[PDB]
Each structure stands twice: as C-alpha cells, then as structure tokens.
C-alpha cells in the first residue's frame, strides 16, 4: 500500500526502506516485472541474489525498528522500476509495500 517513491543518482548507492513483519521468516524485495503477471525475487533471506544484481545488493534485518533495509550499490537504467517488498513463500501474494526507482543523470 505505502510508496516510498525513493529517488537516487546514477552511480553511488540508494537504500530501500521496507517494513520488517513478525511471524514471517522469508523476507524478499521482489521486482514487479509486470510482463505476464509475474514477479521475480531479486533477494531473499533464503539466500538468492539474481544474477543481474549479484554482488551489488544486500539485505540486513534488525528487530530494533521492525524495519529491514536493503541497499543497492551502483545504478543502471534497468534500475528504474517497481520493487514491491513482502514476506511469505508465495512471492506474488505478498508485496506488502510498493516502491518506485529512477535515475537522475
């Protein structure tokens, strides 16, 4: 429901803020491909970093503020879409929060 509408610059890094829920172990930052009604997991607690994002993203969880922060290092035109974050085994039936990304260059 909520949209951070996070913004950033080409290069550098940008931090995505998403809520960390309880009674849900798998936490993911899925990318809304919006092609054939499918969402592809970019990162997860089960340890799966997409090949296109390998070595550029990380996920750190802390129960201090029921918040988990995901950082994306570097930036490319490709990195300018929707990254719905959520929990649960089914990736398409989670997406608790929706966010948008772009590039300023």
């Amino acid at each position: 429901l909520p949209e951070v509408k996070v913004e950033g610059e080409l290069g550098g890094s940008v931090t995505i803020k998403c809520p960390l829920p309880e009674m849900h172990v798998r936490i993911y930052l899925c990318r809304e491909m919006a092609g054939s009604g499918t969402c592809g997991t970019v990162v997860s607690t089960t340890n799966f970093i997409k090949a296109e994002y390998k070595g550029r993203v990380t996920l750190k969880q802390y129960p201090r503020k029921n918040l988990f922060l995901v950082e994306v290092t570097q930036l490319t035109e490709s990195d300018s879409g929707v990254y719905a974050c959520g929990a649960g085994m089914n990736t398409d039936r989670g997406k608790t929060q929706k966010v948008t990304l772009n590039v300023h260059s």
Binding site: C30, T38, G40, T41, T46, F48, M89, N90, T91, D92
Partner: peptide, 10 residues
C-alpha cells in the same frame, strides 16, 4: 507445483 510458487528456482 508448490516449488514454482516461490519465484526462485526449480
């Protein structure tokens, strides 16, 4: 089927 409702691997 339940493996595919994960969006990570098969």
């Amino acid at each position: 089927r339940e493996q595919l409702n994960l969006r990570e691997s098969a």
